[PDB]
Design a binder for this molecule. Structure first.
Ligand SMILES: CCCCCC#CCC#CCC#CCC#CCCCC(=O)O
Length: 264
């Protein structure tokens, strides 16, 4: 039954996420290839084609850094939607109380977002806009503070995560395991969530043993990556709060504001 469950998780991940690691590698390796954004000129060209509405305001357009942060937030919002539908494939998740489903998604979504962002990152940049742009790591580092500090730690996480050479069948179960953490603040039925976690982690452990016979420590490596992601998200929320306090034009999407609210 456990091999079947791993396959059901994988198929739900292929169905629910617009981007997966195979589809990202096809693009990253060179009809509508991605537009390369490496400087302000190419950012502005890409925006005029790919997010025309955001730059249709003339002198009232926001600063480039704010537009970029807005685009990242739109990606997070879309990924929340995808993750919410994916979670239904996890045994036991849809049987939880509605409020526990909300709590698990609230704390898990950004950990999952940053885990999956690795699939669209290489050491030089990241795919954006449904695979139609590639923005360079150096260009993001060149932005004015604090905005140059947003993505770089996510690239740092991703380069080491990508060196584990996981595939989509692994990542789907890793994302399911992120969502099933029984220690999230405020859960009502911890016991049932712990059992749900145990089940998915069991599926993950057996799958990794099969799919990665060459790396006997891959399971504990991934347990550590889950802890690293929790710390990455805590730090990310702190930076977002700095932006909220000091950057009046950098409007936070209400869905994301709610996710952040009372989180850490
Ligand atoms: C025309 C396309 C222009 C591309 C502009 C760009 C770009 C860079 C990018 C990107 C994809 C992403 C993402 C998820 C995230 C995050 C953390 C921050 C948001 C949040 O706090 O939610």
């Amino acid at each position: 039954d456990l091999k079947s469950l791993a396959k059901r998780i994988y198929e739900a991940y292929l169905k629910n996420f617009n981007m997966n690691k195979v589809k990202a590698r096809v693009i990253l390796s060179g009809n509508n290839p991605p537009f390369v954004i490496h400087d302000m000129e190419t950012l502005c060209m890409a925006e005029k084609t790919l997010v025309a509405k955001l730059v249709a305001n003339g002198i009232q357009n926001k600063e480039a850094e704010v537009r970029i942060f807005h685009c990242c937030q739109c990606t997070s919002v879309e990924t929340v939607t995808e993750l919410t539908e994916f979670a239904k494939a996890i045994p036991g998740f849809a049987n939880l109380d509605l409020n526990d489903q909300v709590t698990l998604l609230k704390y898990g979504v950004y950990e999952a977002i940053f885990a999956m962002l690795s699939s669209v990152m290489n050491k030089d940049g990241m795919l954006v806009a449904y695979g139609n742009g590639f923005i360079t790591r150096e260009f993001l580092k060149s932005l004015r503070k604090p905005f140059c500090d947003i993505m770089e730690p996510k690239f740092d996480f991703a380069m080491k995560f990508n060196a584990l050479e996981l595939d989509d069948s692994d990542i789907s179960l890793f994302v399911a395991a992120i969502i099933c953490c029984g220690d999230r603040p405020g859960l009502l039925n911890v016991g049932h969530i712990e059992k749900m976690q145990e089940g998915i982690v069991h599926v993950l452990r057996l799958h990794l043993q099969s799919n990665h016979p060459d790396d006997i420590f891959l399971f504990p490596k991934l347990l550590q990556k889950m802890a690293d992601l929790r710390q990455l998200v805590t730090e990310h929320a702190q930076l977002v709060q700095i932006i909220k306090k000091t950057e009046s034009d950098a409007a936070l999407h209400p869905l994301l504001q709610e996710i952040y609210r009372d989180m850490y």
